Amino acid sequence: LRRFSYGQLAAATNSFDQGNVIGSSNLSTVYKGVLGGMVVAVKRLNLEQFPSKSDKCFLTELATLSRLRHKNLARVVGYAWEAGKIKALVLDYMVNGDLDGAIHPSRWTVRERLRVCVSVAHGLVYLHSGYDFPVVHCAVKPSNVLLDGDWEARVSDFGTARMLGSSAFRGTVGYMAPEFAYMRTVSTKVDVFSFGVLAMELFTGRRPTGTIEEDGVPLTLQQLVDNAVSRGLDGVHAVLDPRMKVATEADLSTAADVLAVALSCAAFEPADRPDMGAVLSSLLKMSK
């Protein structure tokens, strides 16, 4: 875990040039950087506008990510920490962007999307039980899944992690377990829920925003998928991502099986949700 200066990160990011921006939110800007010539991502918190959650998310990401390692997790290289000037994480650069960009001939066949689910599941199994204490990520969603030079998925963005010991929901709310969104309850099951929603979006191509139908009742992504799965393989086909090739029985059957797993993950009651271990198990049977 190297500590970097402002000047070092300024130089690496070409003076934080707009053309090096590879990612943005209200709370941070992520820059491509080059330090032995190692390519990195520099996640720079927005200290000027949002000092106190910049601090919370900075320290959370730094404390959490510096203790963890796994092939399906983002990797921290170092940080810069100069109050009032810069707080930044220096991360392994992931050349193929994030899963949100990948979702919204194509490489993203049913098998390749199943592979991403498996990879993310490995990351989440490690978070929940591979370290000395369970780490709950709390923001599982496609924009927090990055892609390798080998298109291997990596769980990223630990700014909301906790260590234990038109639309229907806009922005990121559609990914959140109800007990997490409404009461900030944190358990490993909140990540199981979000993983279910991620998998649904990955195979339908639909953000989990949902829709207010015209009686004013919201149709969640989960309910859309539940209705399709209940209508059999032909129902599932109707709801799958139109940009995804679904030609063989095997590809449709595999996608149907993922959505059935995703529906169990997104159960309303936390106790009805499987653990990530059983989720991984189901997905590993489906990669055979």
Ligand X SMILES: Nc1ncnc2c1ncn2[C@@H]1O[C@H](COP(=O)(O)OP(=O)(O)OP(=O)(O)O)[C@@H](O)[C@H]1O
Residues 122-151, one symbol each (x = binds ligand X by CB under 6 A, - = not), give -----------------x---xx-x-----
Subset of residues 56 to 95 that bind ligand X, contact rule: CB under 6 A: 74, 91-94
Q: Which of 10, 11, 27, 246 binds ligand X (CB under 6 A)?
A: 27
Q: Is 157 in the site for Mg ion (CB under 5 A)?
A: yes
Cβ closest to Mg ion, residue 23 vs residue 210: 23
DSSP 73: B
**Shortest distance in whole angstroms from residue 141 CB to ligand X:** 7
DSSP H or E segment with residue 211: strand 211-212
150 φ/ψ sector (left φ>0, alpha ψ -120 to 50, else beta):
alpha
| Selected range binding ligand X among 27-35, 112-120, 205-213, 256-264, rule: CB under 6 A | 27-35
Length of the chain: 288
DSSP H or E segment with residue 265: helix 249-265
Cβ closest to ligand X, residue 23 vs residue 196: 23
**Shortest distance in whole angstroms from residue 139 CB to Mg ion:** 6
Contact 105, 245 (CB under 8 A): yes
E strands in 18-159: 21-24, 28-34, 39-45, 76-82, 86-92, 135-136, 145-147, 153-155
From the list 61, 59, 4, the residue with the least C-alpha distance to 34 is 4
Q: Is 281 in the site for ligand X (CB under 6 A)?
A: no
Q: Is 159 in the site for Mg ion (CB under 5 A)?
A: yes
| Selected range binding Mg ion among 65-73, 147-155, 156-164, 197-205, rule: CB under 5 A | 156-164
- Residue 87 CB partners (closer than 8 Å, separation 6+): 44, 45, 47, 54, 55, 58, 79, 80, 81
Q: Contact residues for ligand X (CB under 6 A)? A: 22-23, 25, 27-28, 30, 41, 43, 74, 91-94, 97-98, 139, 143-144, 146, 156-157, 159
Q: Contact residues for Mg ion (CB under 5 A)? A: 157, 159
